[PDB]
Structure 1
């Protein structure tokens, strides 16, 4: 697999090492890992590393929040593969009022008090910006177990669905929170088109590198929770080609989305519309795209199936 040239240069948060030890150490202590092999596989994945690649300009005292959130979402994302759609739904829905803080967690159940203490600590640091991450997360959670995964999809209908499943909206809200970057409602409405374009890039790039992992999961895990739902699968069906052939095609498509990103930003600047905050925001989106690809290229999570 040889990716076509990109002009996006990845950046990593300077405190990636010490934050990784802090966050990984927290979960290694509280999260219920089945065995030592799973604990090693968890650390080898580098969940704090990809977070620092996603938000390399996050505030030094806020990056750990983003690392914790993505880490626990990664862990749950794997757990749902062994559940049914019904079981997965009940699992996620129980965490939602706990995320809001309306329901106290069962402190004998790790996933509950980890989720609870997280959002409680995020509200203590920045209450307003933390609340604006809630619903985007819930939107992503409820999309994970939507039965539309089991029904046939075209490329467009899939990309429209994956925008929720890849958590584009939560990642955007997390980025703002981590950077302290507040944007007016009108400002967010201007980059709505740029957000939708960024989502397709994050989704497909992930689909390309994580296909072999998700292929194996669909054959060994739960037939519903581990169902093969990816652009690589769908494009291979539509065009009747191998999955490897679909990857090469989807990669060219990703570069076109990068090209569109630059065009949409340029138009935003041509018109007197790119505010200083919007300038920082769209740069952050590029860091997400380039950071996602860098990590996906190198992370053990996608390279060792075992």
Structure 2
């Protein structure tokens, strides 16, 4: 799969080696892995590396919080594949009061106390910005087990649902937290179209690279939790082509969304509407798109 040309230069946080060591090391002590094979596969995924490619301009003392959060969410995302929608929903709903800090964790259950301690530490660092990540996380969690996954979707309807299931909004709030980048509600409302476009790119690039893993899961895991819900299958069905052909076509559409991101950013500036915070923010989204792609292309999570 030769990626078509992009004008985006991916960038990686300069503390990625140290933070990956710290965070992988934390999860290897605390998380319950079913065996050695799983522990090695965990390290091979490089979950702190994807984080550092997503947020290459995070503050040095904040990048580790983001790595911890995306790491725990990835581990949960995989666990849900062995569950029904109802089981998965119960699992996620238990973590929500714990994430808010309202209910104490059972210390003999690593997902509970990892989540509790992580969000406590985030609020201890920046309460206001940490709090702004909560509802976006919950929105994503609830999307993950939404029964709409077992209903037929066309490309447009899928992308609208996928914006939640991909965690676009939590990733935006986490990006802002990690950079200490505060935006007003007026600034936030102004970039909604830019956010919705960026979401499509993150989602589809992920779908392209994760298709084989998800196909295998769909054949071996739970009939609900493991269900194949991906633009790759949707376009292959709609257009009657192979999944491989669908990927080639979808990658071209991803470059069209890159072009649209540039035009939308230009138009924001050409109207009177770009602020310094908004420029840092839309540039940050660019890094999410290119970093997501660079990680997806290199991670053993998708290639083995």
1:209 positional shift: 0.4
1:189-225 CA-to-partner distances (Å, cap 9, x unmatched) read 1111000000000000000000000000000111110
Q: Where in structure 2 are there 5+ consecutive unaligned residues?
A: none
What is the CA–CA distance in structure 2 between the aligned matches of 1:186 and 1:236, rounded to whole Å?
40
1:68 positional shift: 0.2
1:272 positional shift: 1.7
1:182 positional shift: 0.2
1:128 positional shift: 0.2
What is the CA–CA distance in structure 2 between the aligned matches of 1:271 and 1:224, rounded to whole Å?
46
1:123-159 CA-to-partner distances (Å, cap 9, x unmatched) read 0000000000000000000000000000000000000
What is the CA–CA distance in structure 2 between the aligned matches of 1:271 and 1:140, rounded to whole Å?
32
Query: What is the TM-score normalised by the length of structure 1?
Result: 0.99
Q: Secondary structure at the match of 2:32?
A: coil
1:263 positional shift: 0.2
What is the CA–CA distance in structure 2 between the aligned matches of 1:22 and 1:298, rounded to whole Å?
21
What is the CA–CA distance in structure 2 between the aligned matches of 1:107 and 1:169, rounded to whole Å?
30
1:258 positional shift: 0.2
What is the CA–CA distance in structure 1 between the aligned matches of 2:248 and 2:36, rounded to whole Å?
37
Aligned positions, number: 304
1:150-188 CA-to-partner distances (Å, cap 9, x unmatched) read 000000000000000000000000000000000000000
1:101 positional shift: 0.5
1:99-128 CA-to-partner distances (Å, cap 9, x unmatched) read 000100000000000000000000000000
What is the CA–CA distance in structure 2 between the aligned matches of 1:273 and 1:138, rounded to whole Å?
30
1:300 positional shift: 0.1
Aligned position for 1:27: 27
Answer yes or no: is 1:110 the counterpart of 2:110: yes
Q: Secondary structure at the match of 2:26?
A: helix
What is the CA–CA distance in structure 2 between the aligned matches of 1:236 and 1:149, rounded to whole Å?
17
Answer yes or no: is 1:152 the counterpart of 2:152: yes
Aligned position for 1:4: 4
1:240 positional shift: 1.1
1:255-277 CA-to-partner distances (Å, cap 9, x unmatched) read 00000000000000111211000
Query: What is the TM-score normalised by the length of structure 2?
Result: 1.00
1:51-104 CA-to-partner distances (Å, cap 9, x unmatched) read 000000000000000000000000000000000101000000000000000100
1:8-31 CA-to-partner distances (Å, cap 9, x unmatched) read 000000000000000000000000
What is the CA–CA distance in structure 2 between the aligned matches of 1:46 and 1:241, rounded to whole Å?
32
What is the CA–CA distance in structure 1 between the aligned matches of 2:156 and 2:271, rounded to whole Å?
29
Q: CA RMSD in A?
A: 0.5
What is the CA–CA distance in structure 1 between the aligned matches of 2:81 and 2:104, rounded to whole Å?
26
Q: Secondary structure at the match of 1:210?
A: helix
